[PDB]
Ligand binder design. Structure first.
Ligand SMILES: *[C@@H]1O[C@H](CO)[C@@H](O[C@@H]2O[C@H](CO)[C@@H](O[C@@H]3O[C@H](CO)[C@@H](O)[C@H](O)[C@@H]3O)[C@H](O)[C@H]2NC(C)=O)[C@H](O)[C@H]1NC(C)=O
Ligand SMILES: *[C@@H]1O[C@H](CO)[C@@H](O[C@@H]2O[C@H](CO)[C@@H](O)[C@H](O)[C@H]2NC(C)=O)[C@H](O)[C@H]1NC(C)=O
Ligand SMILES: *[C@@H]1O[C@H](CO)[C@@H](O[C@@H]2O[C@H](CO)[C@@H](O)[C@H](O)[C@H]2NC(C)=O)[C@H](O)[C@H]1NC(C)=O
Ligand SMILES: *[C@@H]1O[C@H](CO)[C@@H](O[C@@H]2O[C@H](CO)[C@@H](O)[C@H](O)[C@H]2NC(C)=O)[C@H](O)[C@H]1NC(C)=O
Ligand SMILES: *[C@@H]1O[C@H](CO)[C@@H](O[C@@H]2O[C@H](CO)[C@@H](O)[C@H](O)[C@H]2NC(C)=O)[C@H](O)[C@H]1NC(C)=O
Ligand SMILES: *[C@@H]1O[C@H](CO)[C@@H](O)[C@H](O)[C@H]1NC(C)=O
Ligand SMILES: *[C@@H]1O[C@H](CO)[C@@H](O)[C@H](O)[C@H]1NC(C)=O
Ligand SMILES: *[C@@H]1O[C@H](CO)[C@@H](O)[C@H](O)[C@H]1NC(C)=O
Ligand SMILES: *[C@@H]1O[C@H](CO)[C@@H](O)[C@H](O)[C@H]1NC(C)=O
Ligand SMILES: *[C@@H]1O[C@H](CO)[C@@H](O)[C@H](O)[C@H]1NC(C)=O
Ligand SMILES: *[C@@H]1O[C@H](CO)[C@@H](O)[C@H](O)[C@H]1NC(C)=O
Ligand SMILES: *[C@@H]1O[C@H](CO)[C@@H](O)[C@H](O)[C@H]1NC(C)=O
Ligand SMILES: *[C@@H]1O[C@H](CO)[C@@H](O)[C@H](O)[C@H]1NC(C)=O
Ligand SMILES: *[C@@H]1O[C@H](CO)[C@@H](O)[C@H](O)[C@H]1NC(C)=O
Lengths: 483, 700
C-alpha cells in the first residue's frame, strides 16, 4: 500500500504546517494584545486629569514603576526556574501556560490595584522568557519533524533510521521561521488597533503637548526630558474603554482557544520518558555547565545587541525621535510602518536561501551601523513639520534590519544545534541574555544618549560574528557532551 | 402682549395705546394701568361683554362714553384714577346701573352741576378725592341709596352747608373723608341732614380750638363712632372744647401731630364711651389727674412721642404727676414709647386695675438703675407684657420685679446692664414665659441665677459677653420648661459638659459666634463635650461662625426630631462617617463658606434621603470622581431646592478644573460607572478555572 501511506503523510504534513501557522498567529495575537494594553496604560497614566479624577490618591506612578520593575527583573527568576519547569509541563504546555499568564495580565487591568496588578507583572516577567524559549524549541522541532517526514517519504530505505537530517533541515526551517517572524512583526502593527480607533481621537494637537521641548533628537538627556503634564483634551468615556478592553480580552481568549485546538500535541510520550530519564538533579546545572561552549561565548554579545536594538525600536525610536516634530498622533503610524518593514524583510530574508548562512546577518547589523550614523549627526527640529517621510524611512529600514537579524539568529541557532536538549538549552540561554539586555536598557533610561554604546556593540559583534565562522571552516572540533 | 391668568388680564406695564382684542372672551378682569390710552371706544368691548371689573387708571382719558356702561352690563368696579376727565355730564352715568365701586381719585374736576348719581342705586364706594371740588353738593334730590364709603379728600372745600348734604336722606354712610381741606366754618344742621354717619376723617384740616369746638357742637345727636383729627393745629384742649361730643356715642378718637402744648383739666370728662385713644407725636409738657377724668370705658391708649422733645438749646424735662391714670380702670393697652420722662414716681401707675399690656421702650432717659420701689405702682395690675428696651439700664436691684406676679413676657434687651446675675432679681415672676436679655453690655451667670424661674420657656442672650457659663451645676438646669434658648456672640471659649442637661423641652438652640473650635477638636481635659446629650426634642440648631475644623462622631446621636442644621462659616474639612445616621428627618442643612473637599455617601446618605433644602455654595470642592461622583449623581437626579447652583459652585482643584462649575462636571468617566469591577473578577475566575482544569486533565 503506497498511496495510502502517501495520503497518511500528506495529512501529517498538513497538520504540521497548520500547527505552525496556528502557533504563529497565536504569537501574533498575544503579543499584539499585550503591547496594545501596555501602551494604552502607559499613555492613559501620563496626565493629571485621568490620574486625579478617576483615581486620585492611589499613586499611579508608583504602581506603574512597580509593574515595570516586576516585569523587567523577574526574568532572572524565570531563567532560574524555566528548564525543569518546561520539561515538567512540556513544549506546548508551557506555551499554553505562558499565553494564559499573558491573558491574566490583560485581565487584571480592569480594576488596576496593587495586590492584583503587581502579582500579574511578576507572573508576566516570569513567563516572558520561557514562553519565547519553548516557542523557538517547538517551532524548530516541528520544522525538523517536517523535514524528517519529507525525507522519509522521498527516501524510504536510503534514509537512515538513526540521525536522518545531518545539518540539512535548513530549506525547511528557513521558510517556517520566516513566516513565523513576519507574523510576530505584524503583531506590532496589530497592537496599534486600540490606539488608532479609540485613543488617537482623544488627545489634542502637538502645539500644546510639545511646548516645553527645547532640545530633542541627539540632545535627549533621557527618554522624555521635555513634555507637557497632560496630553488628553477630554476625559475618555468609560463605556468605550470597557468596550475596547472587552474586545481585547475576547481576541486574547480566541487566540487561547485556537492555539489549544490547532496546536495538537508535539511532546511524544516516548521522548517525554526519554527526557525524564535524564533526572531532576543534573538538569538544573546543565544550562550553567554549558558555558564551556565555543559558540555561546561569542554569540552572547549578539543576543545582547538583538535585545538592545529591539528595545531601541520599541522605545528609543518612538519616544526619542518620532516624538520630536509630531506628538502622539503619528507614533502609531511609525510603529505600523516599522512593523510592515519588518514583515517585508521577513520574506526578503526568506529569499536568501541560496546564499550561505552568515551572509545577511552582519549585513543587517551593518544596516544599523549606517542607520546609527544618521542617528548620530542628524537632529530633527521639534517645532517644525517640514520633513516627515524621513521618519518612516528610518523606521522601515530599522524594521528591515531588526527582522533580518532576528531571523538570522533564529536560523543559525536552529542549524548549529539539532538535538532537542541542545535546542532547548541554547534557546533558553539566548532568551535569558535577551531579557538581561532588556533589563539593562531599562536601567539605561534617563541617560544622555545610548547611541555610542549601541554602535560600539555593533562593531564588537560584526568582527566577533565573523570570527566564529572563520574557525568552523578550519575544523576546530569542540562540542559539550552532557548526555 | 397682555398676561392672562385666572379670569384676569395683566396688561399694565406694556405702554399700549389701543384696546387689545386678543384676550379671551370669557374674562372678567381688565387691568390697564400705566398706559397711554386716549379714551375708551364703546364699540370694541362687544367681544368680551362679560367684563366684571375694569381698571383704567394711570392714563389720560378726557371723556367717558355713556354707552361704555350699557354694552357691558356686568360692570361692577369702575376705576379711573390719575386721569384727565374734565367735566361730568348728566347722561354720562345715566345708563350705568350695575355699578358698585367708582374710583375717581384724580381727574381735576372743578364743578358738577347735574344729577349724575341718580341711577347708580347699587353704588357702595365713591371716590372724588384730589379734585377741584369746592362744594360737597352732588345733586338736587335724595339719591345714592346704598352709599357707604364717600371720599372727598385733597379738595378745596371751604364750607359745609346744610343744603349741600340733603341728598343723603336715608343712606347708611360708613366712612367719610374730608382730609387735607382747609375748612373755615361749619354750617348749623349740616351733619343732621345725613341719615347715618359712622366714621369721619379730617386729617390735616388746619382746625383751631374754636373750630373743633363748633364742630363738636355740630356733631351732636348723631351716631358717629370713629373720629380722627390727625396732623391738625390743635394747640391746646379745654373742657368746653369737647363739650358737644357728650351726646353721641364716640368709640375711637385720634389726636396725632397736633403739637399739643398741654391738656386741660377735665377736657376728656364729657366723653363716657371712648374706647380707643391716640395721642401719638405731641409735645405735652404737663399731666394732671384731672386731665384724664371721665375716661371710664377707655381700653386703648398710646402716648408714643407724646411728650416734650429733647431741646438741645434749653434743657426741659416733662413731668407727670402721681395718680395720672387712676380713672382709667378699664385700660388694657398702654404705650409710651420714645419719651423723655426722667424717672418713675411712687404712684404713677396707681389705679389701673385691669392693665395688661405696657410698652416702655425708650421712655426714661435717666432711669439707669431699677429699685424694688420703682414698680410698686403696678402691683395691683395683672400685667402680661412689659417692654424696657432702649432704656439705658445699668443695674437691677433685689426684688425689683416682685410686685409683678402675673407678668408673662419681659424684655430687658438693648441696654447697658453691667452687673452679675445673682438670681434674686427674678423673684415674684411665677407666670413669666419669655425673658429678653439680648444686646446687653456685660453679665455674669451664677448657679442660682434662674432657680426662682422654673416656668421659663424662652431665654435670649444675644451679644451679652457671657462669662462663668462653665460652672457646676448648670445655671440652665432649673429651667425645666425651657423651649427656646438663644445665646450668640458671647465668645465663650470653655463650656462645661453638664450644661444643657435634662432639657427635654428644648426645641430651638442658637450657638452663633461663640468660638467652639478648641473645645471639640481634641480636648485636653478629655474628649468631645457633646453637650447635646438628652436634647431629644431639639428641632432647630445653629452653629455658624465658630471656626470648628472637625466634627466628633457621636455628638448628634439620639437626635431624631432635629430638623435644621446651620454650620456655615466653619473650618471643617474631613467629616467622619456615620455622623448623620440619626438625621433621618432632616429638612434643611446649611454648609457654606467652609473647607469641605469631598462629599461621600457613607456620610451624607441618611440626611439626603428626605432633605428639603440645602445650601453648600462658596466651598472648595475637589472635582474628582472618588470625591464627588455620588454628590453629582444625587444633585442631578434629586429635586431638592438649591440656591445659586450654577453660579457659586466652583472647583478649586485640580488645576485643570480651576474655576469650573460643579454642575458641568461629568461622572460618566468614573470608576463606579462601568462594570469592570465585576468583569475583572468573572474573567479572572473563568481563566484560572480553565487553565487549572485543562492542566490537571491533560497531565493525567
Ligand atoms: C419690645 O420693643 C422692641 C422695640 O419696639 C421690640 O423689638 C422689635 O423686635 C422685632 C423682632 O426682631 C423687630 O422686627 C425685626 O426688625 C428687624 C430690624 O431690626 C428686621 O430686619 C426684621 O425683618 C423684623 O422686622 C423690630 O424691628 C423691633 N422693633 C424695633 C423698633 O426695632 C421687641 O420685640 C419688644 N418686645 C416684645 C414685643 O416682647
Ligand atoms: C503645558 O501646556 C499648558 C497649555 O496647554 C501650559 O500652560 C500655559 O502656561 C503658560 C505659562 O506662562 C501660560 O502663559 C499659558 O497661558 C498657559 N496655557 C494655558 C493655561 O492654556 C503649561 O505651562 C505647560 N506645562 C509644561 C510643563 O510644559
Ligand atoms: C426696698 O428695699 C430696701 C432696701 O433693701 C428696703 O429698705 C429697708 O426698709 C426696712 C423697713 O422700711 C428697714 O428696716 C431696712 O433697714 C431697710 N434696708 C434694707 C432691708 O436693706 C425697703 O423696705 C424695700 N421696699 C419694700 C416696699 O419692701
Ligand atoms: C441680693 O440677694 C443676693 C442673694 O443671692 C445677695 O447675695 C448674697 O449676699 C450674701 C451676703 O454676704 C452672701 O453671703 C452670698 O454669698 C450672696 N449670694 C450670691 C449668690 O452671691 C445680695 O447681697 C443681695 N443684694 C442686696 C442689695 O440686697
Ligand atoms: C411645665 O409645663 C407643664 C405643662 O403645662 C406644667 O404642667 C402643668 O402644671 C399645672 C400646675 O399644676 C397643671 O394645672 C397642668 O395641668 C399641668 N399641665 C400638664 C400638661 O401637665 C408644669 O407645671 C410646668 N412646670 C413649671 C415648673 O412651671
Ligand atoms: C499649530 O501647529 C502647526 C503645525 O504645522 C503650526 O503651523 C501652527 O502655527 C501652530 N499654531 C499655533 C502654534 O498657534
Ligand atoms: C392692577 O394692576 C396693578 C399693578 O399690576 C395693581 O397694583 C392693581 O391692584 C391691579 N388692580 C386690579 C383690580 O387687578
Ligand atoms: C345688571 O346685570 C344683569 C346681569 O346681566 C342684567 O340682567 C341687568 O339687566 C343689569 N342691570 C340692572 C340690574 O339694572
Ligand atoms: C328714604 O327716603 C325717601 C325720600 O327721602 C323715601 O322715598 C324712601 O322710601 C326712604 N327709604 C326708606 C327705606 O325709608
Ligand atoms: C373704627 O375703629 C375700630 C377700632 O380701631 C375699628 O375696629 C373699626 O373698623 C373702625 N370703623 C371704621 C368705619 O373705620
Ligand atoms: C339730642 O338728644 C338729647 C337727648 O335725647 C335731647 O334732649 C335733645 O333734644 C336732642 N337734640 C336734638 C336737636 O335732637
Ligand atoms: C389744672 O389744675 C391744676 C391744679 O389745680 C392747675 O395748676 C392748672 O392750671 C389747671 N389747668 C387748667 C387748664 O385749668
Ligand atoms: C422648595 O421649593 C418649593 C418650590 O419653590 C417650595 O414650595 C418649597 O417651600 C421649598 N422648600 C424649602 C424648604 O424652601
Ligand atoms: C442631569 O444633567 C443633565 C445634563 O446637565 C440634564 O439634561 C438632566 O436633566 C439632569 N437630570 C435631571 C433629573 O434633571
Amino acid at each position: 500500500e503506497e498511496e495510502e501511506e502517501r495520503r497518511y503523510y500528506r495529512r501529517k504534513r498538513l497538520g504540521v504546517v497548520k500547527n505552525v501557522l496556528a502557533a504563529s498567529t497565536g504569537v501574533t495575537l498575544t503579543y499584539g494584545v499585550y503591547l496594545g494594553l501596555l501602551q494604552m496604560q502607559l499613555i492613559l497614566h501620563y496626565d493629571e486629569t485621568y490620574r486625579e479624577v478617576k483615581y486620585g490618591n492611589m499613586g499611579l506612578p508608583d504602581i506603574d514603576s512597580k509593574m515595570l520593575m516586576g516585569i523587567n527583573v523577574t526574568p532572572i527568576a524565570a531563567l532560574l526556574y524555566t528548564p525543569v519547569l518546561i520539561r515538567f509541563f512540556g513544549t506546548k504546555w508551557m506555551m499554553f501556560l505562558a499565553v494564559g499568564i499573558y491573558a491574566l495580565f490583560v485581565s487584571t487591568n480592569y480594576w488596576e490595584r496593587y495586590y492584583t496588578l503587581v502579582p500579574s507583572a511578576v507572573a508576566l516577567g516570569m513567563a516572558i522568557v520561557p514562553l519565547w524559549a519553548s516557542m523557538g524549541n517547538y517551532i524548530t522541532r516541528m520544522s525538523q519533524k517536517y523535514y524528517e517526514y519529507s525525507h522519509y517519504k522521498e527516501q524510504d530505505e536510503q534514509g537512515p533510521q538513526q540521525r536522518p537530517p545531518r545539518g540539512s533541515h535548513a530549506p525547511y526551517l528557513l521558510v517556517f521561521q520566516a513566516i513565523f517572524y513576519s507574523f510576530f512583526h505584524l503583531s506590532f502593527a496589530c497592537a496599534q488597533l486600540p490606539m488608532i480607533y479609540f485613543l488617537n481621537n482623544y488627545l489634542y494637537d502637538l502645539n500644546h503637548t510639545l511646548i516645553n521641548v527645547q532640545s530633542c533628537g541627539t540632545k535627549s538627556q533621557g527618554i522624555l526630558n521635555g513634555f507637557n503634564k497632560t496630553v488628553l483634551r477630554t476625559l475618555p468615556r468609560s463605556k468605550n474603554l470597557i468596550v475596547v478592553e472587552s474586545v481585547l480580552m475576547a481576541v486574547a481568549f480566541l487566540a487561547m482557544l485556537m492555539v489549544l485546538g490547532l496546536c495538537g500535541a508535539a511532546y511524544r510520550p516516548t521522548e517525554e520518558i526519554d527526557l525524564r530519564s535524564v533526572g531532576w538533579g543534573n538538569i538544573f546545572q546543565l544550562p550553567f555547565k554549558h558555558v564551556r561552549d565555543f559558540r555561546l561565548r561569542h554569540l552572547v554579545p549578539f543576543f545582547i545587541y538583538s535585545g538592545f536594538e529591539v528595545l531601541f525600536a520599541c522605545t528609543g525610536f518612538a519616544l526619542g525621535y518620532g516624538v520630536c516634530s509630531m506628538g502622539l498622533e503619528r507614533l502609531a503610524y511609525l510603529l505600523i510602518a516599522y512593523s510592515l518593514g519588518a514583515s517585508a524583510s521577513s520574506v526578503l530574508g526568506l529569499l536568501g536561501l541560496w546564499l550561505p548562512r552568515s551572509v545577511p546577518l552582519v549585513a543587517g547589523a551593518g544596516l544599523h551601523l549606517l542607520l546609527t550614523l544618521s542617528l548620530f549627526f542628524w537632529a530633527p527640529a521639534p517645532r517644525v513639520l517640514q520633513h516627515s517621510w524621513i521618519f518612516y524611512f528610518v523606521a522601515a529600514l530599522w524594521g528591515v534590519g531588526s527582522a533580518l537579524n532576528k531571523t538570522g539568529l533564529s536560523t543559525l541557532l536552529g542549524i548549529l544545534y539539532e538535538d532537542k536538549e541542545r535546542q532547548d538549552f541554547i534557546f533558553t540561554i539566548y532568551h535569558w541574555w535577551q531579557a538581561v539586555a532588556i533589563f539593562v536598557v531599562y536601567l539605561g533610561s534617563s541617560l544622555p544618549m545610548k547611541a555610542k554604546l549601541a554602535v560600539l556593540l555593533v562593531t564588537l559583534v560584526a568582527a566577533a560574528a565573523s570570527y566564529l565562522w572563520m574557525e568552523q571552516k578550519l575544523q576546530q572540533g569542540l562540542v559539550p557532551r552532557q548526555p | 402682549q397682555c398676561t392672562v391668568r385666572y379670569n384676569v388680564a395683566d396688561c399694565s406695564h406694556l405702554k399700549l395705546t389701543h384696546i387689545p382684542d386678543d384676550l379671551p372672551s370669557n374674562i372678567t378682569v381688565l387691568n390697564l394701568t400705566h398706559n397711554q390710552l386716549r379714551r375708551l371706544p364703546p364699540t370694541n368691548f362687544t367681544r368680551y361683554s362679560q367684563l366684571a371689573i375694569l381698571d383704567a387708571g394711570f392714563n389720560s382719558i378726557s371723556k367717558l362714553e355713556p354707552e361704555l356702561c350699557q354694552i357691558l352690563p356686568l360692570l361692577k368696579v369702575l376705576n379711573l384714577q390719575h386721569n384727565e376727565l374734565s367735566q361730568i355730564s348728566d347722561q354720562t352715568f345715566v345708563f350705568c346701573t350695575n355699578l358698585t365701586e367708582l374710583d375717581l381719585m384724580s381727574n381735576s374736576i372743578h364743578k358738577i352741576k347735574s344729577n349724575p348719581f341718580k341711577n347708580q342705586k347699587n353704588l357702595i364706594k365713591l371716590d372724588l378725592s384730589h379734585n377741584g371740588l369746592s362744594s360737597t353738593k352732588l345733586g338736587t334730590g335724595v339719591q345714592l341709596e346704598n352709599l357707604q364709603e364717600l371720599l372727598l379728600a385733597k379738595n378745596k372745600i371751604l364750607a359745609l352747608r346744610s343744603e349741600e348734604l340733603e341728598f343723603l336722606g336715608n343712606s347708611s354712610l360708613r366712612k367719610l373723608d374730608l382730609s387735607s381741606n382747609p375748612l373755615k366754618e361749619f354750617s348749623p344742621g349740616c351733619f343732621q341732614t345725613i341719615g347715618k354717619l359712622f366714621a369721619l376723617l379730617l386729617n390735616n384740616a388746619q382746625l383751631n380750638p374754636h373750630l373743633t369746638e363748633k364742630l363738636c357742637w355740630e356733631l351732636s345727636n348723631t351716631s358717629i363712632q370713629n373720629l380722627s383729627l390727625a396732623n391738625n393745629q390743635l394747640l391746646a384742649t379745654s373742657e368746653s372744647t369737647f363739650s358737644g361730643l357728650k351726646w353721641t356715642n364716640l368709640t375711637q378718637l385720634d389726636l396725632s401731630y397736633n403739637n399739643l402744648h398741654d391738656v386741660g383739666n377735665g377736657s376728656f370728662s364729657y366723653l363716657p364711651s371712648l374706647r380707643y385713644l391716640s395721642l401719638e407725636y405731641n409735645n405735652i409738657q404737663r399731666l394732671s389727674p384731672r386731665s384724664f377724668y371721665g375716661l371710664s370705658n377707655l381700653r386703648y391708649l398710646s402716648l408714643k412721642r407724646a411728650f416734650t422733645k429733647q431741646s438741645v438749646s434749653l434743657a426741659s424735662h416733662p413731668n407727670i404727676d402721681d395718680f395720672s391714670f387712676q380713672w382709667l380702670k378699664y385700660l388694657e393697652y398702654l404705650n409710651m414709647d420714645d419719651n423723655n420722662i426722667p424717672s418713675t414716681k411712687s404712684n404713677t401707675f396707681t389705679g389701673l386695675v385691669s392693665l395688661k399690656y405696657l410698652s416702655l421702650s425708650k421712655t426714661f432717659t435717666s432711669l439707669q438703675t431699677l429699685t424694688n420701689e420703682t414698680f410698686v405702682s403696678l402691683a395691683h395690675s395683672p400685667l402680661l407684657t412689659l417692654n424696657l428696651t432702649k432704656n439705658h439700664i445699668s443695674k437691677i436691684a433685689n426684688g425689683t420685679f416682685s410686685w409683678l406676679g402675673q407678668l408673662r413676657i419681659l424684655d430687658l434687651g438693648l441696654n447697658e446692664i453691667e452687673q452679675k446675675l445673682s438670681g434674686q432679681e427674678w423673684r415674684g415672676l411665677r407666670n413669666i414665659f419669655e425673658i429678653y436679655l439680648s444686646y446687653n453690655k456685660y453679665l455674669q451667670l451664677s448657679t442660682s441665677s434662674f432657680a426662682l424661674v422654673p416656668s421659663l420657656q424662652r431665654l435670649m442672650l444675644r451679644r451679652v459677653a457671657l462669662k462663668n457659663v462653665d460652672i457646676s451645676p448648670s445655671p440652665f438646669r432649673p429651667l425645666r420648661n425651657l423651649t427656646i434658648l438663644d445665646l450668640s456672640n458671647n465668645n465663650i471659649a470653655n463650656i462645661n459638659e453638664d450644661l444643657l442637661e435634662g432639657l427635654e423641652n428644648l426645641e430651638i438652640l442658637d450657638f452663633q459666634h461663640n468660638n467652639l473650635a478648641r473645645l471639640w477638636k481634641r480636648a485636653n481635659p478629655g474628649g468631645p463635650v457633646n453637650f447635646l446629650k438628652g436634647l431629644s426634642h431639639l428641632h432647630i440648631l445653629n452653629l455658624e461662625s465658630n471656626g470648628l475644623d472637625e466634627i466628633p462622631v457621636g455628638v448628634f446621636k439620639n437626635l431624631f426630631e432635629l430638623k435644621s442644621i446651620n454650620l456655615g462659616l466653619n473650618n471643617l474639612n474631613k467629616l467622619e462617617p456615620f455622623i448623620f445616621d440619626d438625621q433621618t428627618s432632616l429638612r434643611s442643612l446649611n454648609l457654606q463658606k467652609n473647607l469641605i473637599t469631598s462629599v461621600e455617601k457613607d456620610v451624607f446618605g441618611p440626611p439626603f434621603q428626605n432633605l428639603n433644602s440645602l445650601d453648600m455654595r462658596f466651598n472648595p470642592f475637589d472635582c474628582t470622581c472618588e470625591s464627588i461622583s455620588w454628590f453629582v449623581n444625587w444633585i442631578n437626579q434629586t429635586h431638592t431646592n438649591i440656591s445659586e447652583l450654577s453660579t457659586h459652585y466652583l472647583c478649586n482643584t485640580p488645576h485643570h478644573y480651576y474655576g469650573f462649575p460643579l454642575k458641568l462636571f461629568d461622572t460618566s468617566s468614573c470608576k463606579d460607572s462601568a462594570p469592570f469591577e465585576l468583569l475583572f473578577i468573572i474573567s479572572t475566575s473563568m481563566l484560572l478555572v480553565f487553565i487549572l482544569v485543562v492542566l490537571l486533565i491533560h497531565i493525567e
